[PDB]
Homo-oligomer: A and B are copies of this chain.
Protein backbone atom coordinates (compact mmCIF):
# COMPACT_ATOMS: atom_id res chain seq x y z
CA UNK A 1 0.00 0.00 0.00
CA UNK A 2 1.03 3.63 -0.53
CA UNK A 3 0.71 4.44 3.16
CA UNK A 4 2.39 7.85 3.07
CA UNK A 5 0.36 9.17 0.15
CA UNK A 6 -2.81 7.85 1.78
CA UNK A 7 -1.82 9.53 5.03
CA UNK A 8 -1.17 12.81 3.19
CA UNK A 9 -4.64 12.53 1.68
CA UNK A 10 -6.20 11.81 5.07
CA UNK A 11 -4.54 14.90 6.54
CA UNK A 12 -5.68 16.99 3.58
CA UNK A 13 -9.27 15.79 3.92
CA UNK A 14 -9.30 16.36 7.70
CA UNK A 15 -8.21 19.90 6.98
CA UNK A 16 -11.06 20.34 4.49
CA UNK A 17 -13.45 19.77 7.42
CA UNK A 18 -11.92 22.58 9.44
CA UNK A 19 -10.70 25.00 6.77
CA UNK A 20 -12.39 23.92 3.54
CA UNK A 21 -15.73 25.72 3.75
CA UNK A 22 -17.68 22.83 2.23
CA UNK A 23 -21.48 22.53 2.16
CA UNK A 24 -23.20 20.67 5.02
CA UNK A 25 -24.06 17.73 2.75
CA UNK A 26 -20.48 17.52 1.52
CA UNK A 27 -19.29 17.81 5.11
CA UNK A 28 -21.39 14.84 6.24
CA UNK A 29 -20.11 12.59 3.46
CA UNK A 30 -16.54 13.80 3.98
CA UNK A 31 -16.66 12.99 7.69
CA UNK A 32 -17.68 9.43 6.88
CA UNK A 33 -14.99 9.13 4.20
CA UNK A 34 -12.30 10.22 6.66
CA UNK A 35 -13.37 7.66 9.26
CA UNK A 36 -13.45 4.94 6.61
CA UNK A 37 -10.04 5.95 5.24
CA UNK A 38 -8.43 5.78 8.66
CA UNK A 39 -9.54 2.14 8.92
CA UNK A 40 -8.53 1.45 5.32
CA UNK A 41 -4.96 2.68 5.73
CA UNK A 42 -4.36 2.02 9.41
CA UNK A 43 -3.41 5.59 10.22
CA UNK A 44 -5.30 8.34 12.05
CA UNK A 45 -5.37 12.06 12.65
CA UNK A 46 -6.89 12.76 16.07
CA UNK A 47 -10.34 14.38 16.06
CA UNK A 48 -13.25 14.25 18.47
CA UNK A 49 -15.86 13.79 17.56
CA UNK A 50 -15.44 11.90 14.37
CA UNK A 51 -17.10 8.85 15.92
CA UNK A 52 -14.79 6.18 14.50
Which of A29, A33, A39 counts the most B-chain CB atoms under 10 A from its CB? Answer: A33
Distance (Å) between the CB of A6 and the closest chain B CB?
Answer: 7
Contact B40 A22 (CB under 8 A): yes
Contact A21 B36 (CB under 8 A): no
Q: How many A residues touch B, CB cutoff 8 Å?
A: 24
- Is A50 interfacial (CB-CB < 8 Å)? no
From DSSP, what is the main secondary structure of chain A's interface residues? helix
Interface of chain A residues 28 through 43 with chain B (CB within 8 A): 29-30, 32-33, 36-37, 39-42
Residues 4-42 of chain A: 1 if any B CB is under 8 Å from the residue's CB, otherwise 0? Answer: 011001001100100011100111011011001101111
